[PDB]
């Protein structure tokens, strides 16, 4: 099949680094520089063979057409109320960016409030974060260009939707928190740095600061409120307590679910916000997470993992703050993860649990923690919620594998709490009842039972004959829960595919013990789990190695690239999106230093020994057996991915093409596509989202020779 030749790519054989006595060659180190003519020529040469490979088979156009048609349905988010007005996001179906609407009442005529689509032709300027003032009369919103994590914060007066002059630059990984006096807003910014700050640079992000911006002034007048010059990795995010009296500062270092918690009683400020605040260091270590729910006077309710891997609710009274004095308000469940908690209608708590990777939602009494009400749900996920302390109603959104889902509304002023369907839209073309979702638990190599969701047409024979698409992540305490995907359902209905999602270790599905079972020394458990999932699918007759595709993104990109090196015989096709591929150097770039809490760092001899064993970049190797080759591989990245710098994929693909691509037994393609005006994925315009899934499933169809099923 292979009609093209791989590009010439220079190998710098002098690029040799010593890691604790282990010599490491890095002959594509030069691809780390995004601005060189050499790297630009590399990207161009690579896209030049990938694109015509992707678009040769009629199948791309059929998939694209079907994706365009089926994805074109109305998409609503959760209403939420702010001051006198209700807001929601809505996309008519195929707008690049969803639009923010406003109404003066739940029944009232809605109008456009913020439409990002007018800010660019190609929809590559996207909303990233926002915060209303406490009275709902002012509005701050972050804009990101071309997919970058970099943000510019702008402001509007809600009444009349008037643009204000205030502009905040150098915002990244930022809180947005207005003081209740409506005077201004906390946010984070990074000091100036040499070179570019647009998403194409690789420079490490250090010394994040906390500022306060007084509305109606220039950024240069902003007050510095917290900084950690002795700890360049610390990140301090601010929020105001529900009563406006306290600034709560959550300090993070890395990606672990832990934080310091300092507070500032604003009323104790000598003269308002004029400099570094009088922080009281309530929790001054990184031993646990303390996520503010609400407070009453000095009694502060937090969701925590302190002594509770599945999370619980505690009350810490600032006037009596020793741990031995804390009250357990809602104790830890023996198995179920308490995902998030909100306070609504003064004295209700809304708790969301994860029970075997499905959400439940319950109402509890603030005073006692006692359960008052269960909101019934089908099997799936809660993905949107609104209802704050002063609100007297909630909205929440249910989604699953087979339906776009339902937005519920509940008037909490009623004696009987009847949640009612607020929005529900059907996707005609996909009849949910032709398909089934099953959950099974398969043993991993050490015997640990791993959950897996399988979605497939009803009535199929388990004869190994179906193409399968297996998804995984396995990291960072992230739970992979049911979500609605038109793109994956087209693979099912129109490509005859079986979809599967493996809840491997590293995620949050079973609390912190599940997270710890897939990080640091034990990162190999993630790859073992995911390999064992593929083997389950094969052994039970859902698919066969030659028809199996694996997919994951970012940390999941690492997952699938590692599995390709480790078990090339198990997979027919591998699509790795925005993957971390150089595990020896990831910490050097942008925000990579934050991931060491899951991965370790190559500066440590112990950690190096874990990393070198699975680093995708450092484990590309011809399979020993003559009858075994590497799967077809597609790496997807983009030139403004400042989350996972695209050098990871560039170096990885250069290595694959040289070590494996040049062998005579390698007939499967090893390709990269680097998109432009795009980044990690957040805020990607519909047009690109459609191009992307069309590329992926066309790659799959062509490598596995799957006919379209009309």
Ligand X SMILES: *C(=N)[C@@H]1CCCN1C(=O)[C@@H]1CCCN1C(=O)CCCc1ccccc1
Give residues in contact with ligand X (CB under 6 A).
Answer: 173, 235, 252, 254-255, 476, 554-555, 580, 591, 594-595, 643-644
> Taking Cα atoms as reference points, which of 390, 140, 181 lies closest to residue 266?
181
Evaluate whether 471 touches 483 at the Cβ level (below 8 Å): no
Centroid of chain to Cα 110: 30
Check the CA dihedral 223-225-230-233 and report its sign: negative
What is the DSSP-derived secondary structure letter of residue 243?
T
Q: Is 324 a catalytic residue?
A: no
Q: Which residue is nearest to ligand X (CB)?
A: 554
Least distance (Å) between residue 690 CB and ligand X: 23
Q: Is 641 a catalytic residue?
A: yes
Q: Is 122 a catalytic residue?
A: no
Nearer Cβ to ligand X, position 66 or 209?
209
- Mark residue 104 as left, alpha or beta (left: phi above 0; alpha: psi -120 to 50; beta: remaining): alpha
How far is the C-alpha of 226 from the C-alpha of 208, rounded, in Å?
Answer: 9
Unique residue bearing structure tokens 């990101």: 144
Describe the chain by its helix, strand, coil percentages, rounded to 5: 25, 35, 45
How far is the C-alpha of 341 from the C-alpha of 350, rounded, in Å?
Answer: 6
What is the DSSP-derived secondary structure letter of residue 661?
I
Evaluate whether 631 touches 574 at the Cβ level (below 8 Å): yes
Nearer Cβ to ligand X, position 345 or 593?
593
Strand ranges in 435-515 using DSSP code E only, listed in sequence order: 435-443, 449-457, 468-471, 498-502
Give burial (CB, 10 Å; 0-12/13-18/19+) of 298.
middle
- Residue among 529, 639, 641, 675 flagged as catalytic: 641
Residue 70's Cβ-side half-sphere holds a number of Cα atoms within 13 Å equal to: 24
- Mark residue 20 as left, alpha or beta (left: phi above 0; alpha: psi -120 to 50; beta: remaining): left
Unique residue bearing structure tokens 């619980």: 312
Nearer Cβ to ligand X, position 32 or 332?
32
Least distance (Å) between residue 497 CB and ligand X: 24
Least distance (Å) between residue 693 CB and ligand X: 19
- Residue among 554, 602, 615, 694 flagged as catalytic: 554
How far is the C-alpha of 653 from the C-alpha of 575, rounded, in Å?
Answer: 12
Nearer Cβ to ligand X, position 618 or 702?
618
Give burial (CB, 10 Å; 0-12/13-18/19+) of 334.
exposed
Spatial neighbors of 108 by CB under 8 A, at least 6 apart, are none
Residues constituting the chain? 710
Nearer Cβ to ligand X, position 454 or 480?
480
C-alpha Rg value of the chain to the nearest Å:
26
> Taking Cα atoms as reference points, which of 136, 110, 139, 114 lies closest to residue 127?
114
Nearer Cβ to ligand X, position 80 or 589?
589
Nearer Cβ to ligand X, position 36 or 285?
285
Least distance (Å) between residue 645 CB and ligand X: 10
Give the count of beta carbons closer than 10 Å to the beta carbon of residue 271. 6
Nearer Cβ to ligand X, position 142 or 545?
142
How far is the C-alpha of 367 from the C-alpha of 327, rounded, in Å?
Answer: 11
Spatial neighbors of 517 by CB under 8 A, at least 6 apart, are 448, 505, 506, 525
- Residue among 133, 598, 680, 694 flagged as catalytic: 680
Nearer Cβ to ligand X, position 43 or 581?
581
Nearer Cβ to ligand X, position 554 or 562?
554
Largest CA distance in the chain: 77
How far is the C-alpha of 40 from the C-alpha of 38, rounded, in Å?
Answer: 6
> Taking Cα atoms as reference points, which of 323, 252, 346 lies closest to residue 291?
252
Q: What is the three-class DSSP state of 592?
A: helix
Just list the catalytic residues: 554, 641, 680
């Amino acid at each position: 099949m292979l009609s093209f030749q791989y590009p010439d790519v220079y190998r710098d054989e002098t690029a040799i680094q010593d890691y604790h006595g282990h010599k490491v060659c890095d002959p594509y180190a030069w691809l780390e520089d995004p601005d060189s003519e050499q790297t630009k020529a590399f990207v161009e040469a690579q896209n030049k063979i990938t694109v015509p490979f992707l678009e040769q088979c009629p199948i791309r156009g059929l998939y694209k057409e079907r994706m365009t048609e089926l994805y074109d349905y109305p998409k609503y988010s959760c209403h939420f109320k702010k001051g006198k007005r209700y807001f929601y996001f809505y996309n008519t179906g195929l707008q690049n960016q969803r639009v923010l609407y406003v109404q003066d009442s739940l029944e009232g005529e809605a109008r456009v409030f913020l439409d990002p689509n007018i800010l660019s032709d190609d929809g590559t300027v996207a909303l990233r974060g926002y915060a209303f003032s406490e009275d709902g009369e002012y509005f701050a919103y972050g804009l990101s260009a071309s997919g970058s994590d970099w943000v510019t914060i702008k402001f509007m007066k809600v009444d009349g939707a008037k643009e204000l002059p205030d502009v905040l630059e150098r915002v990244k990984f930022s809180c947005m928190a207005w003081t209740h006096d409506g005077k201004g807003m906390f946010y984070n910014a990074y000091p100036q740095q040499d070179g570019k700050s647009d998403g194409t640079e690789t420079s490490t992000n250090l010394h994040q600061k906390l500022y306060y911006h007084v509305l109606g002034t220039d950024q240069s007048e902003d007050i510095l409120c917290a900084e950690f010059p002795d700890e360049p990795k610390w990140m301090g995010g601010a929020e105001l307590s529900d009563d406006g009296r306290y600034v709560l500062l959550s300090i993070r270092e890395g990606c672990d679910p832990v934080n310091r918690l300092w507070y500032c009683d604003l009323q104790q400020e000598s003269n308002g916000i004029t400099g570094i605040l009088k922080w009281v260091k309530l929790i001054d270590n990184f031993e646990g997470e303390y996520d503010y729910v609400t407070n009453e006077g000095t009694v502060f309710t937090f969701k925590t993992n302190r002594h509770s891997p599945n999370y619980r609710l505690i009350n810490i009274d600032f006037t009596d703050p020793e741990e031995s004095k804390w009250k357990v308000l809602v104790p830890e469940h023996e198995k179920d993860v308490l995902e998030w908690v909100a306070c609504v209608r003064s004295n209700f708590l809304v708790l969301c649990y994860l029970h075997d990777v499905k959400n439940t939602l319950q109402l509890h009494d603030l005073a006692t923690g006692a359960l008052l009400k269960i909101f019934p749900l089908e099997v799936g996920s809660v993905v949107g919620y609104s209802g704050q302390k002063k609100d007297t109603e909630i909205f929440y959104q249910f989604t699953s594998f087979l339906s776009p889902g339902i937005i519920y509304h509940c008037d909490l002023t009623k004696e009987e709490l009847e949640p009612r369907v607020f929005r529900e839209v059907t996707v005609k073309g996909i009849d949910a009842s032709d398909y089934q979702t099953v959950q099974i638990f398969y043993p991993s190599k050490d015997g640990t039972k791993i959950p897996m969701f399988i979605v497939h047409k009803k009535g199929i024979k388990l004869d190994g004959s179906h193409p399968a698409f297996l998804y995984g992540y396995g990291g960072f305490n992230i739970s992979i829960t049911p979500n609605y995907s038109v793109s994956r359902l087209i693979f099912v209905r129109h490509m005859g595919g079986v979809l599967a999602v493996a809840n491997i270790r590293g995620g949050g599905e079973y609390g912190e013990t599940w997270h710890k079972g897939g990080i640091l020394a034990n990162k190999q458990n993630c790859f073992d789990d995911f390999q064992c999932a593929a083997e389950y699918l094969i052994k039970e007759g859902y698919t066969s190695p030659k028809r199996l595709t694996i997919n994951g993104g970012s940390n999941g990109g690492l997952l699938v690239a590692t599995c390709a090196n480790q078990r090339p015989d198990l997979f027919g096709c591998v699509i790795a999106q925005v993957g971390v591929m150089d595990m020896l150097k990831f910490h050097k770039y942008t925000i990579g230093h934050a991931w060491t809490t899951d991965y370790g760092c190559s500066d440590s001899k112990q950690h190096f020994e874990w990393l070198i064993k699975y680093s995708p970049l450092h484990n590309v190797k011809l399979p020993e057996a003559d009858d075994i080759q590497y799967p077809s591989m597609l790496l997807l990245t983009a030139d403004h991915d400042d989350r996972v710098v695209p050098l990871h994929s560039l170096k990885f693909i250069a290595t694959l093409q040289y070590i494996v691509g040049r062998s005579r037994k390698q007939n499967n393609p090893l390709l990269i596509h680097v998109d432009t005006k795009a980044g990690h994925g957040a805020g990607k315009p519909t047009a690109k989202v459609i191009e992307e899934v069309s590329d992926m499933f066309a790659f799959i169809a062509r490598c596995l020779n799957i006919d379209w099923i009309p």
